[PDB]
Design an enzyme around this catalytic site. Structure first.
Site, PDB file in Angstrom:
ATOM      1  N   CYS A 263       0.842  -1.187   0.000  1.00 14.55           N
ATOM      2  CA  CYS A 263       0.000   0.000   0.000  1.00 14.55           C
ATOM      3  C   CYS A 263       0.882   1.243   0.000  1.00 14.55           C
ATOM      4  O   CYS A 263       1.737   1.408   0.878  1.00 14.55           O
ATOM      5  CB  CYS A 263      -0.934  -0.010   1.206  1.00 14.55           C
ATOM      6  SG  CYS A 263      -2.056   1.387   1.312  1.00 14.55           S
TER       7      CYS A 263
ATOM      8  N   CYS B  62       0.752   3.760   3.011  1.00 15.99           N
ATOM      9  CA  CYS B  62       1.237   3.256   4.290  1.00 15.99           C
ATOM     10  C   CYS B  62       2.676   3.664   4.581  1.00 15.99           C
ATOM     11  O   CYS B  62       3.105   3.579   5.736  1.00 15.99           O
ATOM     12  CB  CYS B  62       1.105   1.732   4.337  1.00 15.99           C
ATOM     13  SG  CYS B  62      -0.584   1.140   4.573  1.00 15.99           S
TER      14      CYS B  62
END
Lengths: 114, 31, 54, 1040
Positions: free
Chosen positions: A37, A40
């Site tokens: 991700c 993140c």
RNA sequence: CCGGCGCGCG
């Protein structure tokens, strides 16, 4: 002799369950993340800064959704990045924040809600 | 123009350890 | 052709050289001199007047 | 380095750590268990007990008082007295091992040292063919061992194989093969051509081959070329083994690896010795390749090279250190045995072998060099150099002309631009940004792997050695192309087998995706480098290494994004070693506290480099700021906000101005002078030493006879200049008396400045007198001047030739005068268009309050990518700031400017902007020299050589030719007799010119000719000069 | 006040 570069510790679902069950004096901040991700990474850096700010007055932990996917789904995680602010008082209720929230927002939540 | 470079960013290597402290950490040099 | 008034010489007392520090003063002598060079003054008269910082 | 740019010192860091782990143990072994001739006393080391203890001196202290930063070695030994049958084991002292700094540099005697990497031919078998005088092809196979031993296998005209060892020593294969015991029967069966070997068997060789020893003796005769018949003995084989087997038959781990490949052998890896089969197998290919079977070995291929880091150089000196220790012990054990004493194991070993051989390795070895500390860029690029020179390597005269060229195996490993200028061109290389040193001494670069569907491929970034580099189809293009077909059939440029192709994407294996993959640090700091000719890229890289840190630094408006990498890896800024909070900040220190650990970080204040450049640090954080481990705390010299900052952003025009920018001259404004834009601090060091003479030791005192009080006005009671005094040319620094003649330390010419540091220090020694050393450091504030050298990052260098008032400079349509004026004729011939891109974008960034960090080769996205970036940012600055002259639709980037002397516009629009200009070390006040007369050489009696020695200028033979071309025979005689070496006539010229009374001809011989006559006399040759009178024909002997 | 080695500039 060499200090560690990261202060946020990665925990399993069972370890997080034990941590939540046990007596807690400081607020517990649980991070759900995945290495694939993109957002993140920024959340990881922000949480490292937050852990630096709250030396012993808060506990910052992270859970990988590629290892605890079912546990994340049980905890009502609808996406990443997702944070859970767990108060040391069992009577109170935890707060789930979704998105790349500002560091000041995290500070406000920790100070005035945990 | 006033930006300070964040050396912990995604485009940087891990912080370079002290050579003496790295030797002592791996238990290669006694105190 | 337009003239201005500026600080041109500052005298200290306990300084070995302008590249040293003073205990309790955050700026070294060099930074103090650089700050003094940036003071904008106004005057209509000529001559080497002297001022005081005490 | 799979996903980020690796640390620029990571090769030095990893090499030294490899030496500590495995280099010490692998070298503390092989240390013989020392036994006496009588075998009574046995001395041995317990290598498993080896230890290193942290140095007692701090790293700052080692350089401060001229010491060596090293750690103690404390292995344990066991001495055996079989006379008493008692064992004594003690922690003996072996020596000091120098320690590498986190920046990758050592400290010896207070001097920073760097160990550079070396390139040399990798061990293995190499096949070459050279034409003879008549053009007949002659093939050759050469064995290269782990120590450079070359065993040449050659085919002659008569097809006879000779194992050539030297230029004359020639030995046949059969004698050499039977020297080790290869029976003549089995040599024939293992080759495809038994007939060829059998045809050369003379009846004399067969008898010697038949027995093992007779082959050895004959091999010795041919190898040594010594008349007579040697006797077979154990010492003869050992003498041969050290000379021949020890140097020409041990391949090593790397040497075995290549031989297993090139000769296609399935031999186990652990066999580190040249097996006899390899020689016989090599002869198969050597004769076989003559008939079209195979290809020749490419000697310039990087797959045939190895790289020796600090790990290999420090471990090798340990091989010399311990071999030097055994000879010390052998003399020591023999000496104590003759006294029948029981010596403690500590007294059998002294620390001189290890300590001295490392002390003298950094001092003398060419690959150990003084760290260049001009600016942060020079500190890191020095350690990443690759050299073919040094011991075991080719010299400039030795170097082949096919070497110094670019080889296709260099791509991603050795920068094709960066090289040294002069005789050593193409022999000193430089590692690429992403290059890595492998586990076989080979250089590796990362490539992105493209694989099929059915493959895991957890990490698709794999480092590729040059040996496997050829056999991959590597593309550098992109996949932004589509037609009515599918994407896999679009064609892109690719590399395969050292050539460039154009194939479809479905046939591509690897992609080169990193932007700075193929360049070194120097070339990676040039914005818009793809618009500069590669010739100027080499020059631009060198000039950035000569930039002087300015008293005030600022970041560049336009960069490449590698400035932050350079700042982090140079160590100039302060980097936190522990997370926490900032509590206190000032000039002298920064205090950081985190997790019950409070640290104090001192800051460097006006320190000196080896290049007389100032070092200074300023805080970059405020009290109450949270810090991560590894984040910046303070900014050093030539560093702003964590980026390399070597120059200034100044307003610049590109036009000719009245010839003051003729050729490469630069016209600047007074604003750069009184604004202190290019002001730099320069610190020199003056040392004086006290020695013990026969008449007595030298004395230091303020009271000096035959000297004025004005000269000695800055001295203290001890006789040394006072801290914080403005010295002058000819002033006194250290007053010293030698019994007593004045031998004081005076300030040289042009050294006027302010004394900032004095170090009165005694070196404690074992004598009754200790050498006193005094170091005087003098700061000099140097503003920019006429004759100084400035340059941009695109190979655009120039000398300042004129400084104008601001009202005389050309000015823009906003009324601002420019700061520099550059000649526009310097672009077309130098072919550096990237400076035009940078100046226009630098102007746009200053108006928009923006900085730009642009990776090179931006045209991979689209055509004219740099043009679209610069033009659109110029228009954005024009529109936002309401400055229509900033972007002109008629001629983008150019604007009409006005003459500051007349107020009239120049006829043509001028390209203006705000580029990044550097100030270089090459400047006046360090090059202006003059001489009337003075000191001469002792032998030649000619004036000295050098500006520092007040020497004169040399009139060489080419200058003598010019004077003979003019016919000026009396100017030539002046520069040959009484301005150089005619001792008698030099003193008369000094006298006549002060009275103005005409100079006569010397008429005698100068001291250089009389010097030649005596030398010819030393060869029993007499050289007489005779004059024959044209009047009476009398022969006159000239005095010589 | 002599020579080697290394690094540079034009």
């Amino acid at each position: 002799f060499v200090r560690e570069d990261y202060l946020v510790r990665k925990l399993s679902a069972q370890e997080l369950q034990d941590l939540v069950k046990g007596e807690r004096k400081v607020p517990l901040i649980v991070d759900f993340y995945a290495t694939w991700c993109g957002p993140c990474i920024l959340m990881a850096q922000e949480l490292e800064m937050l852990a630096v700010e709250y030396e012993s007055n808060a506990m910052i932990v992270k859970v990988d959704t590629d290892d605890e996917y079912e546990f994340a789904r049980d905890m009502q995680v609808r996406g990443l990045p997702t944070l859970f602010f767990i108060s040391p008082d069992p009577s109170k209720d935890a707060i789930r924040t979704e998105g790349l929230i500002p560091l000041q927002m995290m500070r406000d939540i920790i100070d005035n809600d945990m | 123009p006033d930006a300070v470079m964040d050396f912990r960013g995604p485009d940087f290597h891990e912080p370079t350890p002290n050579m003496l402290s790295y030797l002592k950490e791996n238990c290669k040099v006694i105190s | 052709e337009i003239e201005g008034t500026c600080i041109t010489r500052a005298k200290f007392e306990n300084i070995p050289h302008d590249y040293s520090n003073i205990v309790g003063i955050q700026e070294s002598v060099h930074e103090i001199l650089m700050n003094l060079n940036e003071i904008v003054l106004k005057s209509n008269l000529y001559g080497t007047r002297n001022a005081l910082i005490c | 380095g799979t996903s980020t740019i690796p640390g620029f010192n990571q090769i030095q860091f990893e090499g030294f750590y490899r030496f500590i782990d495995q280099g010490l143990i692998e070298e503390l072994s092989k240390f013989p268990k020392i036994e006496d001739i009588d075998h009574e006393i046995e001395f041995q080391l317990f290598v498993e007990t080896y230890q290193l203890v942290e140095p007692l001196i701090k790293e700052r202290d080692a350089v401060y008082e001229s010491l060596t930063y090293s750690s103690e070695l404390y292995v344990s030994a066991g001495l055996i007295w079989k006379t008493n049958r008692n064992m004594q084991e003690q922690r003996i002292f072996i020596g000091n091992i120098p320690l590498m700094n986190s920046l990758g540099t050592f400290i010896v005697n207070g001097i920073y040292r760097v160990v550079i990497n070396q390139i040399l031919q990798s061990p293995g078998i190499y096949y070459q063919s050279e034409l003879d005088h008549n053009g007949i092809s002659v093939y050759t196979g050469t064995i290269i061992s782990d120590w450079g031993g070359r065993l040449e296998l050659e085919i002659d005209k008569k097809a006879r194989i000779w194992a050539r060892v030297s230029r004359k020593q020639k030995i046949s294969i059969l004698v050499l093969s039977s020297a080790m015991g290869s029976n003549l029967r089995e040599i024939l069966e293992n080759v495809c051509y038994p007939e060829i070997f059998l045809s050369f068997l003379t009846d004399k060789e067969k008898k010697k081959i038949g027995s093992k020893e007779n082959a050895i003796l004959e091999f010795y005769q041919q190898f040594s070329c010594v008349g007579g018949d040697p006797i077979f003995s154990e010492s003869l084989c050992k003498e041969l083994q050290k000379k021949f087997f020890h140097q020409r038959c041990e391949l090593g781990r790397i040497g075995r690896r290549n031989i297993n490949w090139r000769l296609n052998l399935n031999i186990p890896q652990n066999n580190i010795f040249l097996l006899p089969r390899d020689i016989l197998a090599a002869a198969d290919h050597l004769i076989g390749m003559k008939f079209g079977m195979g290809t020749l070995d490419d000697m310039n291929h990087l797959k045939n090279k190895r790289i020796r880091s600090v790990a290999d150089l420090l471990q090798d000196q340990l091989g010399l250190a311990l071999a030097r220790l055994e000879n010390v012990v052998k003399g020591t054990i023999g000496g104590a045995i003759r006294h029948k004493l029981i010596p403690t194991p500590q007294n059998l070993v002294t620390s001189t072998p290890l300590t001295t051989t490392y002390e003298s390795f950094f001092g003398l070895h060419p690959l150990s060099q003084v760290l260049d500390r001009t600016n942060p860029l020079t500190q890191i690029v020095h350690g990443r150099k690759l050299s073919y020179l040094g011991p075991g390597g080719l010299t400039g005269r030795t170097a082949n002309f096919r070497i110094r060229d670019i080889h296709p195996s260099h791509y991603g490993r050795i920068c094709p631009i960066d090289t040294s200028e002069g005789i050593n061109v193409g022999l000193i290389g430089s590692l690429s940004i992403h290059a890595r040193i492998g586990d076989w001494g080979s250089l590796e670069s990362p490539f992105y792997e493209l694989v099929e569907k059915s493959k895991k491929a957890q990490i698709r970034m794999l480092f590729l050695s040059p040996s496997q580099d050829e056999y991959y189809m590597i593309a550098a293009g992109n996949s932004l192309a589509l037609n009515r077909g599918i994407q896999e059939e679009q064609v892109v440029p690719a590399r395969y087998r050292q050539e460039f192709l154009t194939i479809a994407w479905e046939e591509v294996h690897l992609r080169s995706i990193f932007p700075f993959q193929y360049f070194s640090i120097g070339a990676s700091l040039i914005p818009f480098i793809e618009h500069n000719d590669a010739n100027r890229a080499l020059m631009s890289s060198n000039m950035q290494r000569q930039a002087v840190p300015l008293s005030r630094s600022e970041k560049c408006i336009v960069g490449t994004g590698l400035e932050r990498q350079v700042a982090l890896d140079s160590g100039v800024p302060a980097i936190a070693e522990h997370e926490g909070k900032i509590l206190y900040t000032d000039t002298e220190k920064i205090i950081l506290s985190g997790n019950e650990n409070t640290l104090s970080i001192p800051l460097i204040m006006y320190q000196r480099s080896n290049k007389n450049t100032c070092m200074h640090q300023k805080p970059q954080v405020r009290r109450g700021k949270c810090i991560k481990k590894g984040q910046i705390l303070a900014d050093g010299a030539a560093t702003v906000g964590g980026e390399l900052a070597l120059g200034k952003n100044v307003l610049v025009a590109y036009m000719p101005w009245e010839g003051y920018n003729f050729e490469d001259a630069v016209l600047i404004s007074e604003c750069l002078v009184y604004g202190d834009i290019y002001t730099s601090f320069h610190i020199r060091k003056y040392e004086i030493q006290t020695h013990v003479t026969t008449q007595g030791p030298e004395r230091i005192t303020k009271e000096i006879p035959h000297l004025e009080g004005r000269l000695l006005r800055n001295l203290d009671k001890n006789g040394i200049v006072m801290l914080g005094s403005w010295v002058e040319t000819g002033d006194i620094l250290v007053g010293k008396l030698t019994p007593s003649k004045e031998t004081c330390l005076k300030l040289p010419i042009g050294g006027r400045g302010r004394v900032i540091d004095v170090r009165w220090v005694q070196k404690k020694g074992g004598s009754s007198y200790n050498p006193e050393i005094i170091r005087v450091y003098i700061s000099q504030k140097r503003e920019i001047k006429v004759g100084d050298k400035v340059a941009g990052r695109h190979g655009n260098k120039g000398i300042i030739s004129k400084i104008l008032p601001r009202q005389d400079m050309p000015y823009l349509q906003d009324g601002r005068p420019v700061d520099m004026v550059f000649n526009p004729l310097g672009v077309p011939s130098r072919m550096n268009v990237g400076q035009i891109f940078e100046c226009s974008l630098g102007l746009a960034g200053s108006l928009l309050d923006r900085h730009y960090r642009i990776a090179p080769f931006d045209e991979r996205y689209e055509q004219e990518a740099s043009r679209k970036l610069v033009f659109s940012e110029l228009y954005e600055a024009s529109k936002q700031t309401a400055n229509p002259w900033v972007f002109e639709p008629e001629y983008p980037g150019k604007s009409r400017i006005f003459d500051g002397r007349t107020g009239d516009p120049f006829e043509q629009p001028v390209i203006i902007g705000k580029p990044y200009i550097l100030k270089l070390i090459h400047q006046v006040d360090d090059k202006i020299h003059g001489r009337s007369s003075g000191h001469y050489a002792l032998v030649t009696q000619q004036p000295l050589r050098g500006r520092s020695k007040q020497g004169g200028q040399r009139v060489g033979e080419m200058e003598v030719w010019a004077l003979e071309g003019f016919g000026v025979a009396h100017i030539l005689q002046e520069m040959l007799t009484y301005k150089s070496d005619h001792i008698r006539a030099r003193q008369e010229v000094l006298g006549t010119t002060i009275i103005g009374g005409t100079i006569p001809k010397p008429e005698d011989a100068p001291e250089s000719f009389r010097l030649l006559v005596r030398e010819l006399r030393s060869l029993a040759l007499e050289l007489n000069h005779f004059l024959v009178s044209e009047k009476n024909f009398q022969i006159n002997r000239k005095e010589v």
